[PDB]
CSV table of C-alpha atoms in Angstrom, one decimal:
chain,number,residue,atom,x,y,z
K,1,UNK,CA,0.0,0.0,0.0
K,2,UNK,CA,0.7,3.8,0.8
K,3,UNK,CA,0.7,6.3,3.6
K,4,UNK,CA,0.9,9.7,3.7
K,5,UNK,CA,-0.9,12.9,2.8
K,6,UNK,CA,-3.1,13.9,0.1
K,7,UNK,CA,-4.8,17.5,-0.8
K,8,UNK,CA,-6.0,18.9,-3.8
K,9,UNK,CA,-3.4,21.3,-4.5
K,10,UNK,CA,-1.0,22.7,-7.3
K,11,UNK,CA,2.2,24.6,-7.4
K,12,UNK,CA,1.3,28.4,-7.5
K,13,UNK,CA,3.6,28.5,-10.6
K,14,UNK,CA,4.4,25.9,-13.5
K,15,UNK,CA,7.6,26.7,-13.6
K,16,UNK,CA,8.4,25.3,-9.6
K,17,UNK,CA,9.6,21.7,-8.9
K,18,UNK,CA,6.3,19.0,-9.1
K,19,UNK,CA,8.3,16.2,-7.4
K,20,UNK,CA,11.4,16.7,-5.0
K,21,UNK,CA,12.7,13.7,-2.9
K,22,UNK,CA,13.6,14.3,0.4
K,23,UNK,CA,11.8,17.6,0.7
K,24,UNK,CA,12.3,20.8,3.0
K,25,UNK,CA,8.4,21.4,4.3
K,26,UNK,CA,7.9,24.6,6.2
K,27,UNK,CA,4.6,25.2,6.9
K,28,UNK,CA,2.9,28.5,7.4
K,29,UNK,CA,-0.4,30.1,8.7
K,30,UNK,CA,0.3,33.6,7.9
K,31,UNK,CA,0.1,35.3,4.7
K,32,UNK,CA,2.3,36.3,1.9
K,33,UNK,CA,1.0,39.3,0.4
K,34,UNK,CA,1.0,43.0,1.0
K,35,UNK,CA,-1.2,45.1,2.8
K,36,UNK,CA,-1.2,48.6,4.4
K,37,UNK,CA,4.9,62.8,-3.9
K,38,UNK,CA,4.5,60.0,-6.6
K,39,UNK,CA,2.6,57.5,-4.6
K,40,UNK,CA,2.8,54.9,-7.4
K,41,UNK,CA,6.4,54.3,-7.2
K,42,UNK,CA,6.6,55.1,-3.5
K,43,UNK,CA,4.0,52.0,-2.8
K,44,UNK,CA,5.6,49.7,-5.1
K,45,UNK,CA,9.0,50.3,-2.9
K,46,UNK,CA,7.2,49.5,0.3
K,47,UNK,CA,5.4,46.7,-0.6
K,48,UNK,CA,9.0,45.6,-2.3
K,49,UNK,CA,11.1,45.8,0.7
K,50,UNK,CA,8.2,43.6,2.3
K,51,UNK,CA,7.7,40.7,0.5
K,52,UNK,CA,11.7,40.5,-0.3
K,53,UNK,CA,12.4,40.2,3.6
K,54,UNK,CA,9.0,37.9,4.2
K,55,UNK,CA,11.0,35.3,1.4
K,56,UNK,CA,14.4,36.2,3.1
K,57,UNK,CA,13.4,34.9,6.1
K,58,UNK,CA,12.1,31.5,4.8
K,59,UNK,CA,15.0,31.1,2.4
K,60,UNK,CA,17.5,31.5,5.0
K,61,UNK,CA,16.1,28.1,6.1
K,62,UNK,CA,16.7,26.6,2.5
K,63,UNK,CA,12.9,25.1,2.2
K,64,UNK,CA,12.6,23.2,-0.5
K,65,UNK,CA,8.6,23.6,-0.3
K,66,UNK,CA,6.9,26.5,1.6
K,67,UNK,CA,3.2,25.9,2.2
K,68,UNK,CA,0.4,28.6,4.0
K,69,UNK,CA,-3.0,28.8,4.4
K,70,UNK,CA,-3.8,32.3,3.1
K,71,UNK,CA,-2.3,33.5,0.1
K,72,UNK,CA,0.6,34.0,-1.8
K,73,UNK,CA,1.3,37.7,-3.6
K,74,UNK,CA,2.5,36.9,-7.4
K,75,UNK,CA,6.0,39.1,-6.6
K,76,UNK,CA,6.4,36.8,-3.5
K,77,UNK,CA,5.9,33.4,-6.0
K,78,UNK,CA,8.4,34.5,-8.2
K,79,UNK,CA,11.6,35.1,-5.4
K,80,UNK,CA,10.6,31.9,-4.1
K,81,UNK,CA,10.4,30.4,-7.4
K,82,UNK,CA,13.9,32.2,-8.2
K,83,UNK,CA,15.3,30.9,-5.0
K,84,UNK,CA,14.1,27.1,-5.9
K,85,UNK,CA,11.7,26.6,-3.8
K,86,UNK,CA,8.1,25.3,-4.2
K,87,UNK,CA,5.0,27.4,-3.4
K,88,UNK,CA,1.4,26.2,-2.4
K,89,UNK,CA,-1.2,28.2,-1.1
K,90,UNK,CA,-4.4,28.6,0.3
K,91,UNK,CA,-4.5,25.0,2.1
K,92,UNK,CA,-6.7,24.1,4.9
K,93,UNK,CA,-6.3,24.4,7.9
K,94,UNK,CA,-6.9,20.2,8.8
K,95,UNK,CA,-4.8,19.6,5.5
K,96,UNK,CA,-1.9,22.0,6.6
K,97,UNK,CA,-2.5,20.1,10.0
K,98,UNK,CA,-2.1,16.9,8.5
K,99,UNK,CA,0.6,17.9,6.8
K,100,UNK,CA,2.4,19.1,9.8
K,101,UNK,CA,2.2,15.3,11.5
K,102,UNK,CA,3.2,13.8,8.8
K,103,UNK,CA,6.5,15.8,8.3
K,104,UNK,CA,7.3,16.9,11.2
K,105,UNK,CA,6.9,20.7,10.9
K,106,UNK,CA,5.4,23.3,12.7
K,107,UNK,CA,3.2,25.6,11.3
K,108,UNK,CA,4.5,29.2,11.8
K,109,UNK,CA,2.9,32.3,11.6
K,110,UNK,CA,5.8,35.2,10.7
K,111,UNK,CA,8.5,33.8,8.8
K,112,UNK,CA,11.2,35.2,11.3
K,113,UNK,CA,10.4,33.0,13.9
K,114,UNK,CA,11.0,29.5,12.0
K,115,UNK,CA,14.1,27.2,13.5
K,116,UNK,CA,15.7,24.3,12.5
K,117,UNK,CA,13.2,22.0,14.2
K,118,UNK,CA,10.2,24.1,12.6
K,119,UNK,CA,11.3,22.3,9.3
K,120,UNK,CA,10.1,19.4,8.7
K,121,UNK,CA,11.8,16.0,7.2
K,122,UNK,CA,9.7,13.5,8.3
K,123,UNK,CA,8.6,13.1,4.6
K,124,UNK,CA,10.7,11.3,2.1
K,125,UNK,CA,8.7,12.5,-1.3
K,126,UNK,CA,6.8,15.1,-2.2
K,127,UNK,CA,4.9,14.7,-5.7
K,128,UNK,CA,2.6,16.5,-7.1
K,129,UNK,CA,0.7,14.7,-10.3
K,130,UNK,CA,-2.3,14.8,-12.0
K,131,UNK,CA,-5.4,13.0,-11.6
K,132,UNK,CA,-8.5,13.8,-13.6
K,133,UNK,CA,-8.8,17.1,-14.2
K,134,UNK,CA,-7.7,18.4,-10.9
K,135,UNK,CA,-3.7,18.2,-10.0
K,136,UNK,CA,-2.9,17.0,-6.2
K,137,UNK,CA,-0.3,17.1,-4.0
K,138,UNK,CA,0.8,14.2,-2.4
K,139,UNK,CA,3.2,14.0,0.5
K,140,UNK,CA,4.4,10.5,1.3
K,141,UNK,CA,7.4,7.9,2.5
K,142,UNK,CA,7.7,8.8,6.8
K,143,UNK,CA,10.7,8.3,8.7
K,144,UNK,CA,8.0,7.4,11.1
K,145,UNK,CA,4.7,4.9,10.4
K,146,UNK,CA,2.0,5.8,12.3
K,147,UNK,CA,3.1,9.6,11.6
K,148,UNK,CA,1.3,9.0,8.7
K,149,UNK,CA,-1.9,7.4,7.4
K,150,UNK,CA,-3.0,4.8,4.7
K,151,UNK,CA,-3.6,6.0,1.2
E,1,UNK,CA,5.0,-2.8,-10.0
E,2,UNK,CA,2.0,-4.6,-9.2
E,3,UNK,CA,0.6,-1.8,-6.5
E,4,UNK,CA,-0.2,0.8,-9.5
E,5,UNK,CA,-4.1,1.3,-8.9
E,6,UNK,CA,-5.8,2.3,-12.3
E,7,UNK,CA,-9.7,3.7,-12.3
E,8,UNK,CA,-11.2,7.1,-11.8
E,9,UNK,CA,-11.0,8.8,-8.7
E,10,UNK,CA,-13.6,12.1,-8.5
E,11,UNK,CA,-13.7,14.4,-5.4
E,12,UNK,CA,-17.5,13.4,-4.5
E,13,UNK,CA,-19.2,11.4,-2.1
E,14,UNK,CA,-22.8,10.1,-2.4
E,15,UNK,CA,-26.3,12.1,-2.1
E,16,UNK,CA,-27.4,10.2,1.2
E,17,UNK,CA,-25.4,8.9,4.0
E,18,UNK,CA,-27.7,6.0,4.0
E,19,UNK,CA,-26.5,4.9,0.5
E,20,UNK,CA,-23.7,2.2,0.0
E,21,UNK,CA,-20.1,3.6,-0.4
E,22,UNK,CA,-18.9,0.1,-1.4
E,23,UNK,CA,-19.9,-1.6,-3.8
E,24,UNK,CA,-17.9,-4.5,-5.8
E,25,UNK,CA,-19.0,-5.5,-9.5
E,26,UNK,CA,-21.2,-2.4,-10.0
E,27,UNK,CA,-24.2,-1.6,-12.5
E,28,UNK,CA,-23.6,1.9,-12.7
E,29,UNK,CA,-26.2,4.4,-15.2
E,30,UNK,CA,-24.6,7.8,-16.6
E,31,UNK,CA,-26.5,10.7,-16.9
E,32,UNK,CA,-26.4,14.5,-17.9
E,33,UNK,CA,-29.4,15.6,-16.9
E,34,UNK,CA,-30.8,16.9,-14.3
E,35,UNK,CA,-33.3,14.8,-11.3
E,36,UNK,CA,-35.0,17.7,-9.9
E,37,UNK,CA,-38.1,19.6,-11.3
E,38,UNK,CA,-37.7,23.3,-12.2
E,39,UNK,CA,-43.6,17.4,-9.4
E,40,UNK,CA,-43.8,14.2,-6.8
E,41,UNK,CA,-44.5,11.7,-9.8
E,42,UNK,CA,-42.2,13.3,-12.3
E,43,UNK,CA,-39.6,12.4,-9.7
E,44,UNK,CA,-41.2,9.1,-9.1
E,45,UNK,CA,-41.6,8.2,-12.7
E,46,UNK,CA,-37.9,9.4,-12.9
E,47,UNK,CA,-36.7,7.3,-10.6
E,48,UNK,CA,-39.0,4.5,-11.8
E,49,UNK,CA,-37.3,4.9,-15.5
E,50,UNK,CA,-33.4,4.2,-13.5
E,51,UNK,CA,-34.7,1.5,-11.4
E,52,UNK,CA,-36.0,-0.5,-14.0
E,53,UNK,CA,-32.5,-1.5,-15.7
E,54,UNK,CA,-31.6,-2.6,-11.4
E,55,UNK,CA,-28.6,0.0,-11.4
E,56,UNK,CA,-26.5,-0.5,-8.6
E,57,UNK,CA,-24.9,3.5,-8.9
E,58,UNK,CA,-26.9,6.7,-10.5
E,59,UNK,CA,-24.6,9.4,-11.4
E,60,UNK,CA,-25.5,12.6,-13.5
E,61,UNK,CA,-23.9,15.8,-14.7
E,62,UNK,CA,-26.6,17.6,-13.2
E,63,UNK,CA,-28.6,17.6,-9.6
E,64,UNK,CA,-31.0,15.4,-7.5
E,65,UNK,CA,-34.1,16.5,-6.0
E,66,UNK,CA,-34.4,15.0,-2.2
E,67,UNK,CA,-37.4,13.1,-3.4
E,68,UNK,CA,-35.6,11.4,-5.9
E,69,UNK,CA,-32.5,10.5,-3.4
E,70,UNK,CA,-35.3,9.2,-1.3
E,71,UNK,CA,-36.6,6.5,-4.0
E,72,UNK,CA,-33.5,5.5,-5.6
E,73,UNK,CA,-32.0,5.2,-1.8
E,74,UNK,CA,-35.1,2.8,-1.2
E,75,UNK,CA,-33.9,0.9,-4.0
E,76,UNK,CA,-30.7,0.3,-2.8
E,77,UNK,CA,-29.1,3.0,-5.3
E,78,UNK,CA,-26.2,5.0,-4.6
E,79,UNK,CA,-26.3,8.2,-6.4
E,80,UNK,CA,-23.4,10.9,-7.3
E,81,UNK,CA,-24.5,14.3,-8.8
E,82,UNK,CA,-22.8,17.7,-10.2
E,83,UNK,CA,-20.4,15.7,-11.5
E,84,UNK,CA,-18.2,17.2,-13.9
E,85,UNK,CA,-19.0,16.2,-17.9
E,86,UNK,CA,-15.5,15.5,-18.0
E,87,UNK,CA,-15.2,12.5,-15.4
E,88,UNK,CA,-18.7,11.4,-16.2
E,89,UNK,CA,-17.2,10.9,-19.4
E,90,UNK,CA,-14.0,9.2,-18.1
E,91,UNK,CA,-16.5,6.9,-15.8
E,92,UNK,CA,-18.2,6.0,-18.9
E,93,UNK,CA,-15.2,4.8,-20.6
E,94,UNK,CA,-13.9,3.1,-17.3
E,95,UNK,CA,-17.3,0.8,-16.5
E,96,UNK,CA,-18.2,0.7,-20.6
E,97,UNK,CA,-21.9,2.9,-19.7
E,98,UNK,CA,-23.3,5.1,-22.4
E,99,UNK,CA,-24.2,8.4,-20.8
E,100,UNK,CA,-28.2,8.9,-21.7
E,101,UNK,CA,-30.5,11.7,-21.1
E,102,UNK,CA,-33.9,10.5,-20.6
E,103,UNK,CA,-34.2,7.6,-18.4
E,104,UNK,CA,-36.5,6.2,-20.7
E,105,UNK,CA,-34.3,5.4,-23.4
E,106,UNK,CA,-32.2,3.2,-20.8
E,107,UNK,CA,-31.2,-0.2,-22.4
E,108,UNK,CA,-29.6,-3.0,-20.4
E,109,UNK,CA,-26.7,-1.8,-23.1
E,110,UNK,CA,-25.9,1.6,-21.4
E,111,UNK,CA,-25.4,0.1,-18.0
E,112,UNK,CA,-21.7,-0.1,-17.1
E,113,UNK,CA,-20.3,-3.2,-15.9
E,114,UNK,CA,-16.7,-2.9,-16.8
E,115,UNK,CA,-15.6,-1.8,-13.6
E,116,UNK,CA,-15.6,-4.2,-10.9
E,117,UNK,CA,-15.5,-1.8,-7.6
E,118,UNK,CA,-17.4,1.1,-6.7
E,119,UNK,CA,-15.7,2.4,-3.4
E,120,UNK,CA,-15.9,6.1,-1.8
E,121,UNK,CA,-13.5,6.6,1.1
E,122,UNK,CA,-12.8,9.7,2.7
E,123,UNK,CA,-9.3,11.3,2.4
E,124,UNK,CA,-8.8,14.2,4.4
E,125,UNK,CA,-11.1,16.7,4.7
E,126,UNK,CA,-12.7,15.4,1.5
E,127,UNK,CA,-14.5,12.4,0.1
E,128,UNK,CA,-13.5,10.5,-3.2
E,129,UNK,CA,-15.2,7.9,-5.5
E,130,UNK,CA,-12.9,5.3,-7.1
E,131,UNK,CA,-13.8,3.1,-10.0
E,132,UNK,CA,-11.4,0.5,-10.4
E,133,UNK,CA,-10.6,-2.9,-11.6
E,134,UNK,CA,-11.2,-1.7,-15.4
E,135,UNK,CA,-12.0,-5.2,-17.5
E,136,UNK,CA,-10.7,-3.0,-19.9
E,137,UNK,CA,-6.9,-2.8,-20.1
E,138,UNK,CA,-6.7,0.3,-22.2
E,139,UNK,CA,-9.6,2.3,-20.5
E,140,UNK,CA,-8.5,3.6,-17.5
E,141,UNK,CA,-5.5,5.6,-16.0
E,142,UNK,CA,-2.8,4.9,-13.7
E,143,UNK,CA,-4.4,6.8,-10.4
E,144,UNK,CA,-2.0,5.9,-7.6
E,145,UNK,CA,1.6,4.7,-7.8
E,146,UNK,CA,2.2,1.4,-5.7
């Protein structure tokens, strides 16, 4: 058979990795977007320098996927996407849970506050293939058994 | 491999809790219209037409009125609806059932039986249908790896 975890997810972007072995789970609660004289430009700076340190925070953990349950700003996608890492958003709060157990993270709110032991590597393979007409993520292979159920 | 599970696998679960969510060797009956109304022996002829050709699933494109879950639950028939044209179509090809409108021009000839289990287990937060054990070797997809 197979254990693991299943949710009906995609990458946010095409471009970022579908299947990675060994994977770098960090999972989040918080969002990645922005929120809150030439205005114009002037906003476009802020909102820059935000989003830039939100994804410096997580990649200074070297992630190889980054997963939330609110959303994920395009500019956001694409430094993570730059940095190699693979983006999904939006999940639910029981799948981001399940998710948790079965890789051994801990969902984190603020990037900043992530440690080593926040990342999880409890999961041995995280693939993400198609099935009908919907795509879905599946998180499988636990260093630990009952860390994970049957699929 | 040897664990590679082929079917269909849709993100729905039945009508009526009451209904089976296992079934092996099922006659299953494709449709892509609607069971509703928009009255209480339109629905009962309705029903009466799918019964008829002893279906063992009912699954449409479209929705089911609670009077007609009611009869086709009495009659020990499981039934699926709002499912997408696209994986009634890929059912159809998986159990061999000819997708009909009018459950009047049901023949014994557009009930599926190419697929040999019917079974809806819950996966996370969600439900899911599988179809499996296609008779046919070149009509349904590799789902799950082993």
């Amino acid at each position: 058979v197979l254990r693991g975890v299943m949710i009906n997810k995609d990458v946010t972007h095409p471009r970022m990795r579908r299947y990675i072995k060994n994977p770098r789970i960090v999972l989040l609660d918080s969002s990645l977007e922005y929120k809150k004289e030439e205005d114009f430009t002037r906003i476009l700076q802020m909102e820059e320098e935000y989003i830039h340190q939100l994804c410096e925070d997580i990649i200074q953990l070297k992630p190889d996927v980054v997963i939330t349950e609110k959303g994920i700003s395009d500019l956001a996608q694409h430094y993570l996407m730059r940095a190699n890492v693979t983006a999904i958003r939006r999940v639910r709060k029981t799948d981001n849970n399940r998710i948790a157990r079965a890789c051994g993270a801990r969902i984190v709110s603020r990037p900043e506050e992530l440690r080593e032991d926040d990342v999880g590597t409890g999961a041995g393979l995280l693939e993400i293939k198609k099935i009908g007409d919907e795509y879905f993520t599946f998180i499988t292979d636990c260093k630990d058994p009952k860390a994970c159920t049957i699929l």
